[PDB]
Structures are given as C-alpha cells and as structure tokens.
C-alpha cells in the first residue's frame, strides 16, 4: 500500500475516505485537529495516463507560483503505486453557492477569470501535452483493458452508439483543429476554490497540460447548464470572454468526457 | 452491475463518482439540470453487515415521517448487488461552516438538537439493533476475510496493538453496558443537513438502529475536537444535553470506529 515512513505519518491524522472531486484514484482526507491533508493513490495499471497521480504531482510542482495550487509534501512509488500527499486547498470550495436564486452572475465571472488565467500561463516548457491524438491513444488503451465505465454510459443517451469503440471511432474521425493553451483538463465547479470573490485554489490536476482552448470552455458551459438552467448566462460568459462559440468543438469535448 | 431498467434511467442524468460522505459502497451522484439523484451500490460480500445498502434502504423507509431523510426511488438486487437510488438531501450540508472564527456555538446546538431528536424516536419496532455483540460479531467477520483497512490503521497511534485482532479482543473484553436508543451509527458533520439553523436532513444511514446512547455522543465530541480545538464547547454540548460525560464509554466508541 504505502511505505512504512508514510504509514507512520498519516496515522497521526484521522484519515477518511474520499469526499471531494476524485475518480479512479483512492483518496484519503487526513483530519487533524489543527489542519487537513490529502493522500491520493493510483497503482500501475493507470501508469502514464492522465489518471496516474505521478503526472498530477509533476503538474502540481510545475504550476508553482503561477496558479494557486496546494503544496506537495510527499510522493513515492511503493509496490507499484504512485502516492501523493499534499496539503489542503486555499479557501472555500466553489461548489457551495448556487442552490439559491439571486447569485448566478458572480459564478460566470469566476469561470471567466479562471479561463483567462490559463491563457496567461506560459505553456512553453510545459511538462505535458493533452492533445487529442494523445488522449485518443490513452482512451484506446483503457478500452483495450476494460479500464472504463460499463456502469453509467452517458453516450447511450446523447449519441446512437452502443459500445464505446464506436463513439471512439466516431471521435477519431471528427477530431477537430487544435490551438494549444493551458488546460485544467477536468474543470468542475468542485475543483475551483474561492476566497473573497477571487479564484484562490485549484485541484484534480492530472489532466493538466497543453490542450485546445475550447476544452476548458466546454466544461464551463456544462456547469452553467446544470447549476443554472438559464441559457442566457452562457452568452454572458461568452460575452465576458469576448469570443464566439465554436459550438461544434464544444460539443466535441463534451462527448469525449463521457468515455472517461 | 445494474438492471437494464435502472441503467436506462440513470443515463438521463450526468452521473459522477462519489463526492460526499461515503465509504465502501460505490456511489454515483446523478446531475440533472433540474435536480439531483444518488445511486449507491454494495455487492454481496458485505451482505447483512451495516455496509450492505439494503440495510440502509430498510432503515431509510422506516424512518419516514420521523427524521428528515431523502426519499427511496428504486432498490434492486442485481447480479449479487444491492443498489439504492434515492433523491437528494434537504437543504445545506452542515460541513461547510466552521473554517472561520465567530461561529462554533451554533454548531454545538445542532449536535444537541440532533441528539435529542434520536432520543425521541420510538425504537420499539425498530428494524435493526446495532448492539455491541452485534457489531463485534460483524467486525470479526470482516477481519476474517481481510475486508478491513490495512491502509490507515488509526489504532496504531492511539493504542499499543499491532494487528486488529488484538484491538478486537481488547474491545470484546472492555465491552461496556448498553442502554438502547436510536443511533445514527455514523454521525459526521457531513451527514447532517441544515436549513435555517434547524436540522433538516440526514444521510449515510446503514448503521442506523438501536444502540447504546453514548455511541452518537462520542461522534459529536470527535467533530467538536477537530472542527474547533477549544475543549470548552465540549462542556457546552454536555451542558445543553444536561448529561454527565461517561468518559470511559466515549473513548470506547471512538476506538471501535477505527477498525471500520
């Protein structure tokens, strides 16, 4: 599981199963009476893919001094397992503030701020590229070893394909044009941390790296539609951002995130 | 995994991995643009134990009209799997409101309200009893099939035992006296839902049932110590509740929850 050294440490804290935005990786929230810690674990099967936490560790260190991210405290490979121990995010989780009526406006602005914040990051010597060909290779790999989701298959409703392979082949042919910017890779309203109306924290950074701009833009739109049914805020978000919706690309990215 | 019928349904919603207070069971948060749903799954290995969701389903239905709980929408046994589909909790999650300075008082009162709310439930024809002998049998079973936690072993720090068996044998001998009341079984500051300062929701109800009073009282104390370092609020909680701390029993229950 974990090296003795780390085993010895995490036990001072209460340690509790995953309660935040997490997916394949095992995740533990360490509860101290003073502060909190987060232990994240992925094995070897997911090595190399955007799931492997070692990738997240790499991106987490790089992004230091650029975007507000948590701090790396411990990272090791143990018995074929990548383990990351990082501190806690800075501030308040954005996910809690939309269950009411008067408030949508401010959210959009955070999404706006988040987006231009990435377009300002010098992606020159960036550690990883999450180009379509990169992901399409990655996805192919997962499907080849049943490392996917047979459970909820979102495509079945959205598209007319039965098995993943097809939606895969379809996406490989519809693969659009890319323009590389800093992409969060999995931008959800539960990875962003607010502090006095200003973005102050980011987490779940395994799919971070270079990737077409529209990618993140597609995720923002998705949240908007769910957390606020009014399609008018989608214009506002696109108005604040000042770019014209490339509707075809947005849809393209919404479909990709269903296979994962 | 799931019956076709249910498969067909959950796919209208976005479906996302567990993001709330959950542990062994697979959990999916269904995100609709109108409302949310929660799919919970445990297989057969955990059948009968306080982990099996079928137990939670049973307690969830019983508690109807007593405590504010979510509603049952679908429950089935499929390929040796207990699956529960329930609506969303009522209100705001109590977990978000203690990261600041001026606010501890109100929390204690909620814990106070939560506690007397259980002591008011007619546990006569209650579905299940989570007496110590019941749990001690249950725990023995888990350890016998490595169905425990080798990862974080909280006891190692708190007690002087190396392997679970010992802490098990120790607890079986120190097993105190019981006085049966309605116990939530896993009362955390992330299972309680607030609405206008009044308790309005409860979840994670698999360990619900008849069990010594002090049990829940031990969990409340634990949160207090973590989310608020001041040991003075522990007096207040015990003052509002008007009972004298049976310190030995409290500790006894804090240790039990470490093996699970």
Curated annotation (Swiss-Prot), chains A, B:
Q: Which GO terms describe its biological process?
A: response to antibiotic
Known EC number(s)? 2.7.1.95
List the InterPro entries hit by this protein, alphabetically.
Answer: AGP_Transferase, Aminoglycoside_PTrfase, Kan/Strep_kinase, Kinase-like_dom_sf
Q: Which Gene3D superfamilies match?
A: 3.90.1200.10, Phosphorylase Kinase, domain 1
Recorded GO molecular functions are: ATP binding; kanamycin kinase activity
Per its record, the protein catalyses:
kanamycin A + ATP = kanamycin 3'-phosphate + ADP + H(+)
Q: Please name one Pfam family that this protein belongs to.
A: APH
Instruction: Please indicate which superkingdom the organism of origin belongs to.
Output: Bacteria
Q: What keywords were assigned to this record?
A: Antibiotic resistance, ATP-binding, Kinase, Nucleotide-binding, Plasmid, Transferase
* Active site residues according to the UniProt entry: 186 (proton acceptor)
The protein's job, in short, is: Resistance to kanamycin and structurally-related aminoglycosides, including amikacin.
Family recorded in the similarity comment: Belongs to the aminoglycoside phosphotransferase family.
**What is the protein's name according to its record?**
Aminoglycoside 3'-phosphotransferase
* Lineage of producing organism: Bacteria, Bacillati, Bacillota, Bacilli, Lactobacillales
Name of encoding gene = aphA
């Amino acid at each position: 599981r974990i090296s003795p050294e780390l085993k010895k440490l995490i036990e001072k804290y209460r340690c509790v199963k995953d309660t935040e935005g997490m997916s394949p990786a095992k995740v533990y929230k360490l509860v101290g009476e003073n502060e909190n810690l987060y232990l994240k674990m992925t094995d070897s099967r997911y090595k190399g893919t955007t799931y492997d936490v070692e990738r997240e560790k790499d991106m987490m260190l790089w992004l230091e001094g650029k975007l507000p991210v948590p701090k790396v405290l411990h990272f090791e490979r143990h018995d074929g397992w990548s383990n990351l121990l990082m501190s806690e995010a800075d501030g308040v989780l954005c996910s809690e503030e939309y269950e009411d009526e008067q408030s949508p406006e401010k959210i959009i602005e955070l999404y706006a701020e988040c987006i231009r914040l990435f377009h300002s990051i010098d992606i020159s010597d960036c550690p990883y590229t999450n180009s379509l060909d990169s992901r399409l290779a990655e996805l192919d790999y997962l499907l080849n070893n049943d490392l996917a989701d047979v459970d909820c298959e979102n495509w079945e409703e959205d598209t007319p394909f039965k098995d993943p392979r097809e939606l895969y082949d379809f996406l490989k042919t519809e693969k659009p044009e890319e323009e590389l910017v800093f992409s969060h890779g999995d931008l959800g309203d539960s990875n962003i941390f607010v502090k006095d109306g200003k973005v102050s924290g980011f987490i779940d950074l395994g799919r971070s790296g270079r990737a077409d701009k529209w990618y993140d833009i597609a995720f923002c739109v998705r949240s908007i539609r769910e957390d606020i049914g009014e399609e008018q805020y989608v214009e506002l978000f696109f108005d604040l951002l000042g770019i014209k919706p490339d509707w075809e690309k947005i849809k393209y990215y919404i479909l990709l995130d269903e296979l994962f």
